[PDB]
Write a protein that binds this DNA or RNA. Structure first.
Ligand SMILES: O=c1ccn([C@H]2C[C@H](O)[C@@H](COP(=O)(O)NP(=O)(O)OP(=O)(O)O)O2)c(=O)[nH]1
Ligand SMILES: [Ca+2]
Ligand SMILES: [Ca+2]
Ligand SMILES: [Ca+2]
Ligand SMILES: [Ca+2]
Length: 903
DNA sequence: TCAAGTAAGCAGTCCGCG
DNA sequence: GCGGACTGCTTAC
């Protein structure tokens, strides 16, 4: 096989690389790498290196990396550009792996660990590490084994050995229900004292040195704690053994706001799964406790135990250890589903960066662009400092707030990247400017053609049309991968609906799930076989189809985040290729494109329907348009339709055969108008929405910009077995809205859109009656909590004190001088509840760490003093009244009148 | 919440608004 | 009480 790096670091004048060699063995080397940088020179100087603008450069080979750094400094002092890759390890990888890397994950040691530390006197601060580590479970991907390190003797209690037998038994039998599938994979090692535990751990570590090191909060907790506890007991040198190169760096951070300390272990690539989850998952969670995330992702009931965690070890060591093992596993389970580790390796190897740099699209794109340019003997520009300037983005149409019965949406394929490609937008394809007219002029096709020669954006920029720029070229590469996985994602989806469909008529028999590949649309043969299956088998397949769809969503959306990250980076002053001319050429092109195709659609529809001036486009945001189809449905009748599927078929057909051609034509014109390099404005039908036929549903509604709801029957070719609600921006979709309330608001929306006013009133009233029965966590608001210290004076609320922050202050007072009480953590999320007047807490609300039960120290009084009425009308009623008025209907009947004597 | 971008909504505070 | 100037937070894209 071809070799690949595992990790790379620059330590002084040496590069340290861990790699897999041509024979599949992990190796390590130290290399005194001599970097090259560049500087402009006179033309006569016949060279083979040119800066991206075609200016000739001379390569300067330095004896070592310090010299090269120093040279950059001097070039600055003199005031000349120092060109080339100044991050030397990236240049190293580029020279060392001058090919498309093919990795083998089975050779890569991915280590997943979790530790426990008993602490009775507060949260065990990693930088303090004053408490013994009494448990460590460390899973190794190569061995596929859970290594358990169990402290038996501590100042906080002496315990007996964990029992794998009891671990396996059902919770209902006194066991801990450690899943049978990993029971065999557990290597258990009890220790008589902590020193012996930690020494063995390091020895173990030296032998199976993590390449990728992950887990849950390992970067802000596990790692710095192990590092500092070993340092406290044995000294730095021993602690530095966590680094294959024995080099570590204390490190921090970024604001804004405050700071935190992490330990940088050289030679290791740390991908804290919480951070991976935050970047790649596209969810916003009320809490990021592993318990909460586990239940969310896997639907596993949270691990339960009596007493505080700080007493768990000594009252129930059995469970303590078992839960440390399950913690490690839950993370493995999330990854098997979401597959963020795979995604990270893919991206890091693609770009040829430290794996952990996938967290940075700027670092990622620098590297992609640099390797691409280096291939042609081109030299990259020096990174320069810029002041931060605001700059305009997308256009958002103001909608008339209303109900909307029949809606079809259309959406441009991957807008910003497509604009980059169509226009040929790149640092080195800038051809000049033209005298701009107001945007509206281009929109209405009255402005003079910007250029007969170059490819233009309405922001005034012109671009070469002879050759593709490196930004278009490279962005095209990731766009195509993205597209491939989206195909797999959508096919797994369509397939899922077929299984769901079958689940209406499950056959009575024992059989197996069909061995198929859910990334591809089912063959008619597989379709027949599914109709003949049992519910148990159909359910299983459905599970696998949905797991395929999730795998595809991970692969596709994050490749989209990457390429969209490029368009955005052009607006970030830290990007080597930062340029507001290019950033705004992209966003201004977008504005034009959307309102241009709005004018076109309206025009098309006023002709076909034989009217004038009608606004068929009711809304639009960035790259999408929403068209009112009432009139298109009416033309046929609305009777004349057997069922709901019948008109969806009709609308589908109309979109595909009449509108998209008209839409393509409109965009082809615009391409010519801007004299663009390549027409890539592809706007496909996205959503088909309306109420069930014969129903009183209102189909859809809008309250304003970025706030709407729709009863979707078909989405991007996926024809749902059950209508799916697409709700955007409304409180159902916000993490700050209480769980119970979201659910309730959603049912309310479902009833409005599917059943109508009367079904709506009925539920709203039923909810209002039963509200007070809801569990307190399910009805608490949620907020991030920033700048507490800022508004703390009393500690009472200082001037301008935010509501949630005030709640925190109320909490802090209630638990004053209570060392065990859970502490609200600056920058994290809290649950918030209002409190009735005259409550013992002395304020109008209280707040506590989200994800948790509020301590037993105050729970009872909080429950007694919760203001249900306030809570209710702020979170449920008010927003609901917002929906109903925009929709022009009533959540309460409502004069009869009628009836006979009740009148 | 270290880690590409802007647009824009709603909650809440403070205070005007005769 | 509703709305602006504003801070904080959170979506859509
Ligand atoms: O996080 C984002 C999301 C979108 N955008 C911009 C770029 C994107 O092209 C445009 C429209 O985003 P969509 O959510 O519609 N996805 P996109 O159009 O990129 O591709 P697709 O619709 O095929 O997913 O909005 C960002 O800048 N950042
Ligand atoms: Ca799009
Ligand atoms: Ca899309
Ligand atoms: Ca059947
Ligand atoms: Ca969109």
């Amino acid at each position: 096989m071809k070799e690949f790096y595992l990790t790379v670091e620059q330590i002084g004048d040496s590069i340290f690389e861990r790699y897999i060699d041509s024979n599949g063995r992990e190796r390590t080397r130290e290399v005194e790498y001599k970097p090259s940088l560049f500087a402009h020179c006179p033309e006569s100087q016949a060279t083979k290196y040119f800066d991206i603008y075609g200016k000739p450069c001379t390569r300067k080979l330095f004896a070592n990396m310090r010299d090269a750094s120093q040279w950059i400094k001097r070039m600055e002092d003199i005031g000349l550009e120092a060109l080339g890759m100044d991050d030397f390890k990236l240049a190293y990888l580029s020279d060392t792996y001058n090919y498309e890397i093919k990795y083998d994950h089975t050779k890569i040691r991915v280590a997943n660990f979790d530790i426990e530390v008993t602490s009775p006197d507060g949260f065990p601060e990693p930088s303090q590490a004053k408490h013994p580590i009494d448990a460590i479970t460390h899973y190794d991907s190569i061995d596929d084994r859970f290594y358990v390190f169990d402290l038996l003797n501590s100042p906080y209690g002496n315990v007996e050995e964990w029992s794998i037998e009891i671990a396996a038994k059902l919770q209902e039998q006194g066991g801990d229900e450690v899943p049978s599938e990993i029971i065999d994979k557990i290597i258990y090692m009890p220790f008589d004292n902590e020193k012996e535990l930690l020494m063995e751990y390091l020895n173990f570590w030296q032998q199976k040195t993590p390449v990728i090191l992950t887990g849950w909060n390992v970067e802000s907790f596990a790692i710095p704690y192990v590092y500092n506890r070993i340092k406290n007991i044995f000294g730095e040198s021993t602690a530095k053994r966590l680094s294959p190169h024995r080099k570590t760096r204390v490190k921090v951070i970024e604001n804004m706001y405050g700071s935190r300390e992490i330990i940088t272990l050289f030679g290791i690539s740390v991908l804290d799964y919480i951070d991976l989850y935050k970047k790649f998952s596209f969810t916003n969670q009320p809490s990021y406790s592993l318990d909460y995330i586990s239940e969310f992702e896997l639907n596993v009931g949270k691990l339960k135990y009596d007493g505080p965690i700080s007493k768990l070890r000594e009252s129930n060591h059995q469970r303590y250890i078992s839960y440390n093992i399950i913690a490690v596993y839950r993370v493995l389970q999330i990854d098997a589903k979401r597959q963020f580790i795979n995604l990270s390796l893919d991206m890091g190897y693609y770009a040829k960066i430290q794996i952990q740099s996938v967290f940075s699209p700027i670092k990622t794109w620098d590297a992609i662009i640099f390797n691409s340019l280096k291939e042609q003997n081109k030299v990259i520009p020096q990174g320069r400092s810029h002041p931060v300037q605001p700059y305009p983005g997308a256009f958002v149409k103001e909608p008339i707030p209303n109900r909307y019965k029949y809606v079809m949406s259309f959406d441009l394929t991957s807008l910003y990247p497509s604009i980059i490609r169509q226009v040929n937008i790149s640092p080195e394809t800038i051809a000049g400017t033209f005298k701009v007219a107001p945007l509206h002029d281009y929109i209405n096709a009255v402005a003079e053609r910007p250029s007969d020669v170059y490819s233009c954006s309405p922001n005034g920029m012109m671009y070469y049309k002879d050759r593709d720029g490196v930004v278009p070229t490279e962005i095209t590469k990731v766009f195509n991968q993205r597209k491939e996985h989206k195909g797999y994602m959508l096919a797994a989806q369509r397939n899922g609906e077929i299984i769901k469909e079958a689940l209406h008529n499950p056959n009575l028999s024992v059989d197996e799930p069909l061995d198929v590949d859910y990334r591809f649309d089912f063959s008619d043969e597989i379709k027949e076989k599914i109709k003949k299956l049992s519910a148990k088998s159909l359910n299983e397949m459905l599970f696998r189809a949905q797991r395929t769809e999730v795998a595809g969503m991970t692969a596709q959306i994050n490749r989209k985040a990457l390429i969209n990250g490029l368009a955005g980076a052009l607006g970030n002053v830290w990007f080597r290729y930062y340029d507001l001319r290019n950033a705004t050429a992209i966003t201004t092109f977008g504005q034009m494109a959307l309102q241009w195709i709005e004018r076109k659609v309206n025009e098309y529809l006023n002709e076909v329907c034989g009217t004038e001036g009608e606004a068929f486009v009711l809304y639009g945001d960035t790259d999408s348009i929403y068209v009112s189809a009432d009139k298109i449905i009416d033309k046929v009748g609305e009777s004349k339709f057997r069922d709901t599927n019948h008109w969806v078929d009709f609308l589908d057909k109309f979109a595909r055969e009449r509108m998209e051609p008209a839409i393509d034509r409109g965009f082809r014109e615009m391409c010519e108008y801007m004299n663009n390099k390549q027409h890539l404005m592809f706007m496909d039908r996205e959503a088909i929405a309306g109420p069930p036929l014969g129903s009183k549903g209102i189909g859809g509604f809008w309250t304003g910009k970025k706030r709407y709801a729709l009863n979707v029957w078909d989405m991007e070719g996926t024809r749902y077995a059950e209508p799916k609600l697409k709700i955007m921006g409304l409180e159902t979709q916000k993490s700050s809205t209480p769980k119970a309330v979201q659910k309730a608001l959603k049912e309310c929306i479902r009833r409005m859109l599917q059943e109508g006013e009367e079904s709506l009133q009925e539920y709203f009233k039923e909810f209002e009656k039963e509200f007070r029965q809801l569990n307190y966590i399910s009805i608490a608001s949620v907020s991030s909590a920033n700048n507490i210290a800022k508004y703390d004076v009393g500690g009472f609320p200082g001037p301008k004190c935010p509501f949630h922050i005030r709640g925190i202050l109320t909490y802090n007072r209630a638990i004053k001088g209570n060392i065990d009480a859970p502490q609200v953590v600056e920058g994290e999320k809290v649950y918030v509840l209002p409190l009735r007047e005259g409550n013992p807490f002395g304020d109008k609300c209280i707040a506590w760490p989200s994800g948790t039960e509020i301590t037993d120290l105050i729970k009872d009084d909080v429950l007694h003093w919760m203001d249900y009425t306030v809570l209710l009308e702020k979170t449920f009623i008010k927003p609901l009244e917002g929906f109903t008025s925009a929709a022009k209907l009533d959540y309460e009947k409502k004069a009869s009148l009628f009836d006979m004597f009740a009148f």
